[PDB]
Design a protein around this ligand. Structure first.
Ligand SMILES: *[C@@H]1O[C@H](CO)[C@@H](O[C@@H]2O[C@H](CO)[C@@H](O)[C@H](O)[C@H]2NC(C)=O)[C@H](O)[C@H]1NC(C)=O
Ligand code: NA
Lengths: 345, 6
């Protein structure tokens, strides 16, 4: 079978969310579709944080199929952490169901992790990085032979650069579970193979980067999480410095600014930039690259590449988020494990 | 921006 998840684009391409249904009877939530993590969680109805009072929460007491656990749940993301306990219940998405899906019932987070209209997150990466130790929903479906083709197809719609865009755009893209949507891409899919040691994040090697016509030293090539739940493109500090050195007038934001790790450059410079994956260059549009002015200096605009130094325990050195992914149709293939890119239709 | 695990 196949099934489609309609995406809502939140925060001007900040996050892309889909509908999950949990429990009996079904309780529905908008959750961030996150190819850079592997746990499902939702805010629980007992959660007393402010964001919980302002969004939809999961009431464990009114699901007849909920199986409680005392087991702690906690997960750490780049943007903060989420804590609570594990539970097990029936979960549906895209017309599919996993009957005894283990997931987090979250009752605290760091400030501003999520808010209305979101209630949680669905991890789309591999079991080995699931904090819960549970098989991800998608991975159960792929493994069970339920899909026409063992892959997920992803289209993230762009609102950055639309000056009349809203903070909630319900026409935000699509994830097709069990195939690729041929109306959304043109030509052939270029698959970059993922070996059996790399099934954690969805990650592939960066072959090269070109910015303003200059090939950047990306030094030993980085493994890149292709991450639908990251807004921008996170790279090592030394690499970010090299990137912005290719744009005339670019500078690091000070730290006093509140924007340490970000870089700004002349707003009237259109930046030509591409990343090379699997022997092909994939351009990033200027509407994705230019984030606008972060300070009162309106002549300077922030770039989509930011400095983020990774733990030396991390198998990824780049996090390649929506800023990139908006420019390609993306296939996350279970078997043979691969990430594919195609030109958008 | 957000940056989704560690
Ligand atoms: C693949 O993408 C197309 C384009 O978004 C989808 O087309 C929409 O499908 C619904 C019914 O499912 C129609 O009522 C809409 O009018 C279509 N939109 C457009 C712009 O044509 C299509 O559903 C997707 N196919 C699959 C299998 O997921
Ligand atoms: Na509802």
């Amino acid at each position: 079978a196949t099934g489609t998840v309609s995406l809502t684009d939140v925060g001007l391409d900040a996050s892309y969310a889909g509908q999950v249904s949990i429990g009996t009877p079904a309780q529905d939530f908008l959750v961030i579709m996150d190819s850079g993590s592997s746990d499902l969680w939702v805010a629980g109805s007992t959660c007393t944080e402010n964001f919980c009072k302002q969004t939809y929460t999961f009431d464990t007491s009114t699901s007849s199929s909920f199986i409680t656990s005392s087991e702690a749940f906690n997960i750490t993301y780049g943007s903060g952490d989420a804590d609570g306990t594990l539970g097990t219940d029936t979960v549906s998405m895209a017309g599919f169901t996993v009957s005894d899906q283990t997931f987090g019932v979250v009752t605290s987070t760091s400030a501003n992790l999520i808010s209305y209209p979101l209630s949680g997150l669905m991890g789309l990466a591999w079991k080995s990085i699931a904090s819960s130790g549970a098989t991800p929903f998608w991975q159960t479906l792929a493994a069970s032979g339920d899909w026409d083709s063992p892959e997920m197809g992803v289209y993230l719609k762009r609102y950055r650069g639309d000056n009349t865009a809203s903070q909630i755009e319900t026409d935000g893209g699509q994830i097709l579970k069990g195939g690729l949507n041929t109306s959304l891409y043109n030509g052939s899919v270029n698959y970059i193979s993922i070996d059996e040691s790399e099934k954690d994040y969805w990650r592939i090697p960066l072959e090269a980067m070109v910015i303003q016509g200059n090939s950047v030293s990306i030094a030993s090539n980085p493994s890149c999480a292709i991450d639908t739940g990251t807004t921008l493109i996170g790279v090592p500090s030394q690499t970010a410095n090299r990137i912005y050195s290719q744009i005339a007038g670019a500078e690091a934001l000070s730290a006093s600014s509140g924007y340490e790790g970000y870089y700004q450059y002349p707003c009237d410079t259109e930046v030509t930039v591409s990343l090379q994956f699997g022997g092909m260059s994939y351009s990033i549009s200027n509407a994705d690259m230019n984030l606008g002015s972060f300070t009162r200096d309106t002549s300077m605009c922030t770039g989509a590449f930011f400095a983020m130094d990774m733990s030396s325990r991390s198998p990824v050195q780049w996090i390649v988020g929506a800023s990139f992914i908006k420019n390609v149709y993306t296939a996350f293939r279970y078997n043979p494990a691969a990430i594919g890119f195609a030109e958008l239709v | 921006x957000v940056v989704x695990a560690x």
